[PDB]
Amino acid sequence: SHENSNSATEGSTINYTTINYYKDSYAATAGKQSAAPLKSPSAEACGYSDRVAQLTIGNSTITTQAAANIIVGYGEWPSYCSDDDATAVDKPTRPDVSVNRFYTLDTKLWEKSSKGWYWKFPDVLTETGVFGQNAQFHYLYRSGFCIHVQCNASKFHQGALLVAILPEYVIGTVAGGTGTEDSHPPYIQTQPGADGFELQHPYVLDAGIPISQLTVCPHQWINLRTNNCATIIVPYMNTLPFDSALNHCNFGLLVVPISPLDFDQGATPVIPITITLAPMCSEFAGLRQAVTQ
Amino acid sequence: SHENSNSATEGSTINYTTINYYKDSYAATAGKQSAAPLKSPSAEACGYSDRVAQLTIGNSTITTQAAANIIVGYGEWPSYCSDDDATAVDKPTRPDVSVNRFYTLDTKLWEKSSKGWYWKFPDVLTETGVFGQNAQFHYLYRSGFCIHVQCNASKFHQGALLVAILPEYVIGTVAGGTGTEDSHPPYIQTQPGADGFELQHPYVLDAGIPISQLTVCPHQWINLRTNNCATIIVPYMNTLPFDSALNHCNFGLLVVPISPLDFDQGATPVIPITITLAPMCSEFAGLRQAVTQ
Amino acid sequence: SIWYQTNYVVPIGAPNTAYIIALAAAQKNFTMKLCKDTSHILQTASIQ
């Protein structure tokens, strides 16, 4: 009562017992603390099977295995911004059928020597559809995503893809190779658009972080013997309630072949990977003239 | 009970006593039949002063005389399409802040020899703003309008404008002058866009209908001694719940000087007429790729 | 319009070309009006 409630943990659900001799709560000691979101839970695990019984959003419809094969990113469904979490006093627009629909980006071909690609969100959809037009016309943007990476192969084909969602996928460079150049990735590399960008070093994910630990991020496998597609339900993950859709990407979708594609000669050599994705609970605010970038 | 209820007056509020000897109600005789919208009512007359106390819609704000100087077209406020009146099973989008806002078109100059201009709706807004983008992207469109024609003049200037709303303002031609050519008006004349089109014969309104009876349509005067602006609240008037915004214009806004502009030399000769208009209760349906026309 | 989202992928031994049978219908909300003579087929000769 006699102290300012201005610590970094006010508003949390954790009760902290602390020692403070000053006016401010942040001056106090760290003290004591008086399914699981991180394991890429399924829709059945999160109990969201009712919203998943038919993946039809807007005016689009995809078909896949239900519930168990629907990865909800961090166990949280996309939602509109709550009244307390939002800061902008302007009321947002909710098109909800012209922006919350499945958009099909491109048809990148999986090869035996394929290294992998990444797609930045919502950079992939900035110049596509009513969602793209709302992204250019509005300063503020907020949406979840339902990304459905599709890769059909016969039962004689083999291989696996780590279809993963890396939030705030900052791209690093080779720094001239020797590491003493301080180069920075260009706009076509940081924001490659709907066409995506092929990974130069998928082992370090072009950021100095191993792909072996990419599974701590929301992810799903496209092991060809088991499933032919991966559906990841990504919520809006940002330090802010809203953000610009043009100069900040909330997350990068990593589609990397961990197990290489392999088949004997006579089967179809064209094994394409299709990125179909739907914004969920899309919000736009701060309306002005449309700007591409 | 024994007759089909298939006359043209089923669903009306008028009880008709009729003589019928057949299975169908439309075979029956005309029979007997067992403020006022047409006089361009004000907002005070329609009792809509609460919605008019401050004309702020979306992110825009105009200033004028309230209630008494707000002409509600045909005594009906614009509204979303009711569940029974709509036929399209696709659910419409309601942006409601990015499309329901005042758009300022152009600054046509009133002259002493000025003849008048017309603006077709929503042709004026097909290539303007989020409303224009929704008009191109969606097959179906439905909106009312709040047109605020602004013409400021000093108290030493004189003149009047019949700012009027003519529903389904079909443009006729001179037919070669002699009347034996069957010419048809071009696209720049039928749909002149936000720039409008100057009237060639404002007496017959370029359609063979006198301007003296234009006041049966929703209208307001800009008699310069009394008011400097006219605000007309037009609802969606069509035979259909929805229509294309690109190849059908619901109404034409007629701004014609009935009393000519006149002033002595020394006052400002530039007396401009500004068209500021806001879609009201705008609905868009039938979403596809954006088409300009 | 029908577009290849990814591809038509077949292994060794499967045919490289398949076929799709489009079957068109109407929903329960479908309705009809103004019965008229059909013009999808026009017999111009007399039936003997």
Added chain:
Amino acid sequence: ETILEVNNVPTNATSLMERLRFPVSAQAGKGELCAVFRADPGRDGPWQSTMLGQLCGYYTQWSGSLEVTFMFTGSFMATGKMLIAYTPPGGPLPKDR
């Protein structure tokens, strides 16, 4: 549901039965175009082969939604995805997916 003759290209009597199905095959993976047709049941074209189309010839005005079912008739090993897009009126034939 009646067979929609999307592939109404062949006219010869020996190839008339090919109208009921349309080919799908391995492409270059660039979102290639497979088949297009107008969504009008009463219009002259693919829809005339359907019972809905032939009955639509007997009625001037129609309303309601339409069901078009695409049945894949490849191998059980044959796999892939198609983007079947219905364009609302106003939009021309899309030049790309």
